[PDB]
Design a protein around this ligand. Sequence first.
Ligand SMILES: O=c1ccn([C@@H]2O[C@H](COP(=O)(O)OP(=O)(O)NP(=O)(O)O)[C@@H](O)[C@H]2O)c(=O)[nH]1
Ligand SMILES: O=c1ccn([C@@H]2O[C@H](COP(=O)(O)OP(=O)(O)NP(=O)(O)O)[C@@H](O)[C@H]2O)c(=O)[nH]1
Ligand SMILES: [Cl-]
Ligand SMILES: [Cl-]
Ligand SMILES: [Mg+2]
Ligand SMILES: [Mg+2]
Lengths: 359, 357
Amino acid sequence: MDTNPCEKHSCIAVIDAGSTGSRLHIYSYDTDDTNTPIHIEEIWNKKIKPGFASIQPNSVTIDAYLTMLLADAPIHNIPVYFYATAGMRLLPQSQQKKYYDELDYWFRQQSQWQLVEAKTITGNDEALFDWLAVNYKLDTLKSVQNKSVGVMDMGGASVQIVFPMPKNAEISKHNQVELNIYGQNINLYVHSFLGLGQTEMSHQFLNSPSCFANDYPLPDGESGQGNAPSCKEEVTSLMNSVHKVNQQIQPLLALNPVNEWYSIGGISNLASSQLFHFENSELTNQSLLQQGDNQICHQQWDILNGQYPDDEYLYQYCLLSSYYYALMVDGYGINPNQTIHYIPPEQNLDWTIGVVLHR
Amino acid sequence: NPCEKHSCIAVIDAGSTGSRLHIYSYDTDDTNTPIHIEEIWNKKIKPGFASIQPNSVTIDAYLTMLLADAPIHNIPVYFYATAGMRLLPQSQQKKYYDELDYWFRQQSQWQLVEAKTITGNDEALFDWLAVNYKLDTLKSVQNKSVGVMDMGGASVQIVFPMPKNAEISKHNQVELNIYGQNINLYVHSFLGLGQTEMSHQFLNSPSCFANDYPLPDGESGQGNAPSCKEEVTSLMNSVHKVNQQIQPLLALNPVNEWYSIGGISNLASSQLFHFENSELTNQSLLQQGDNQICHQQWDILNGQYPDDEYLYQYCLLSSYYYALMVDGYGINPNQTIHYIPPEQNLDWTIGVVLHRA
Ligand SMILES: O=c1ccn([C@@H]2O[C@H](COP(=O)(O)OP(=O)(O)NP(=O)(O)O)[C@@H](O)[C@H]2O)c(=O)[nH]1
Ligand SMILES: O=c1ccn([C@@H]2O[C@H](COP(=O)(O)OP(=O)(O)NP(=O)(O)O)[C@@H](O)[C@H]2O)c(=O)[nH]1
Ligand SMILES: [Cl-]
Ligand SMILES: [Cl-]
Ligand SMILES: [Mg+2]
Ligand SMILES: [Mg+2]
C-alpha cells in the first residue's frame, strides 16, 4: 500500500448497515481491460454500534450517527454505497423511508462524499455479495472452477446461503442470479431467511432451560439446565416446522453438491472462543455440538462466567452451538462431519467487496 | 393537591414499545390495603427504555421526558420493566439500571423505591389485579372465574384462578390475600410471542399480507387469514408448546369471562374493524382480517387508509391472535373476549398499588 492510495488508484466507500452495527469500508482498486476492478485492497475500515435501524430517525440522531461512522475517514471525496440489510428489512417501507429521507438530506448538505445509493438490499442481493466477497478472497473468480464453493453468512437478523446451480425455470427468479465476471459466466442459487439470524432466533428460546448453562438465571425465574441435543431439537422446530428450511434447500443441495463450505458472520466469533478446540480455521457441526454440550451446556454458569471474563456473548454459547447445528445439518442437510471453513474474526470480512465487483 | 390528603405513588410500566408513568392517589382500609384508587396523572413516551443506548446523556433525556412535567412530585416511584428488558442478558441490563439509579440519586423531586426488570409471572399477576380492580370483582367472593390476557409487543401473559397444585411449577402459581379473601392463580408469560417479536418470523409469508404487498425478499403478498393462522400456530405449538401447557389447565379450571388488555385493543378499535360493546370473538376477528385486509389489493387499501401506521400488519395480527387464543389456549372461537377501550390506557400498574411484593 502507498501513502494516500486514492491519489494513485480508484477508490469507493461501501457501508454494510447490518442489524447489530454499521461498517464503513474504503477500497482502492485498478481495473482490467473491461473496467472491472482488480487488485482490490481495503485501505480503511470503521465499525460502530448499534445498528442503523435501531436509532430514532430525525435529523439530530442521523447526523450524530453518520458523523460517528464517516468523519475520521482519511478520504471523503469518493462514491458511497450505503446498503442496509436485515435490521431495516424488519421495518415496513413507510418506516424505512423516514431513515433514508434523513440520510439523503444529510449527504446533500455536505460537499465531499458522493452518495451513489442508499437503500435496503434484499436478502437475495446480500447473498450474491456474500458469495462474490468470499470467492474474491479465495482467488476463484479469475478462472472456471473444478470445485463448487458454497457460502453461508450467519448474521444477527437473517442468514444467507448461496452456491452454484444451473438455471432452473421451476425455481423463483428471485432465488437465482447469472453474472459474467472476468470473462466467465456463473449461475448461483441465493436464499436468505429473515428472522433466523442469531439475535432474532434467540428471542424464541430465552426461557428454554436446555439452551443455557446449569443454574444460568432465565428471565422467567427458572434455572438453566443445559443439554445441546435437546436445545438443538427445539431450534429445529423453528427451522423446519415454521420456516420450512429443509424443504426449500435440501432438494437443491443434494442435486448441486458443494465441495467446499465457507462461513462468514457472527459464527466466526463463536468458533474462535477458547472454549472450543478447532484447527486450521475450520469446524464440523458434530464437533461444535459435542463441544458446546460438554464445555458450556453442562457446566455451572457462575464458574463459566468467572472463568471467561472476555467472552461478552458467553451466556448464549450453548444456544448458539445448538442453533448452528440445527440450521446447517437439520435445515440445509449438510453432513455433520463435513468441514465448514470460517474466516478468522479479526479479519472483519463481510459482503462489501461484492459491491465493488458487481456495480 | 390530592397527595396532601391521600397516599400517592408513581408506577412506571417500562414496556417494549414505550414507557408509561401513572400517579395514583388512594386511601387504605383497616388492614392498610389500598381503596378508592384514582389515577391523577399519566404520561406515555416512546420508544421502549431497553431500545435506548444506556449512557448518562441518553438516560437523562429519556427520564426527563417521562417525569419532568408531572403536576405532582415528592412521591415514591416504582420503575418496573417488562419483556423489552428481558430480551437482554443481565450483564447488559445492569448498565441501564446503574445509569437510572445514578439519575435518581442526582435529583430531589422523586424518591426511587425500586427499579428492576419484573418476571413475566409477576407481570401476569399485576395484569389480573389491575383488571379485576377495575371491574370491582376483588371486594367479594365471585361466583364467576375471570381470566385476563395481556397482548403485549414482546411477551403475552395469561392468568386465571386455579387451586394450588403440587404438580405445577411454583413459579407459575400465586397465592394472595386481598380484602380478606384468599385467591389462587395460575400465571404464565410467553417471551417472544408478543406481536413485534412474533412478526419477525413471518414477514416473508405471502399468506400473511394483502395481495401484492411488497415482502422484503421481493415476492408479493397473497393474503389468506386461515393459511397465515396455520403458520403462526406452528410457532405457538410446535416451538413454544402453548397448547400442551395451557389447554389441560383451562379444561379443568374453566373461565367464565375473558378480558384482554395490551395492543389487541388498538387493533379491535381501528377503522378497519367493526366491534360493538368493546368485545370481539376470535371467529369474527379472523373473518374481518381475512376480508377487509388479506383479500384486498395493497396499493388500493393503503391509499384508502393513510392514517393507520399499523394497517400493513392487520392480516398477520388478526391471524396471530386467533392462532394464540384458539389454537394455543384452546378458547372457543365464538367465546366473547372483552377488551378495554384503548383511550383508557389501562396497563397492569394498578396491580403494583395493590401488591408491592
Ligand atoms: O468476521 C466477523 C464477523 C462479525 N463480527 C462482528 O460480530 C457482530 C455480529 O455481526 P454479524 O455478522 O453477526 O451480524 P450483522 O450485524 O451483520 N446482522 P445482519 O447481517 O444484518 O443480519 C458485529 O459486531 C460484527 O462486526 C466480527 O467481528 N468479525
Ligand atoms: O389499551 C391500550 C394498550 C396499549 N396501548 C399502546 O399501544 C402500544 C403497545 O403497547 P402494548 O401493550 O402492545 O405493548 P408493550 O409496549 O406494553 N410491550 P410488553 O408488554 O413489554 O411486551 C403502546 O404505545 C401503548 O401505550 C394503548 O394506547 N392503549
Ligand atoms: Cl419471563
Ligand atoms: Cl429478505
Ligand atoms: Mg451482516
Ligand atoms: Mg405491556
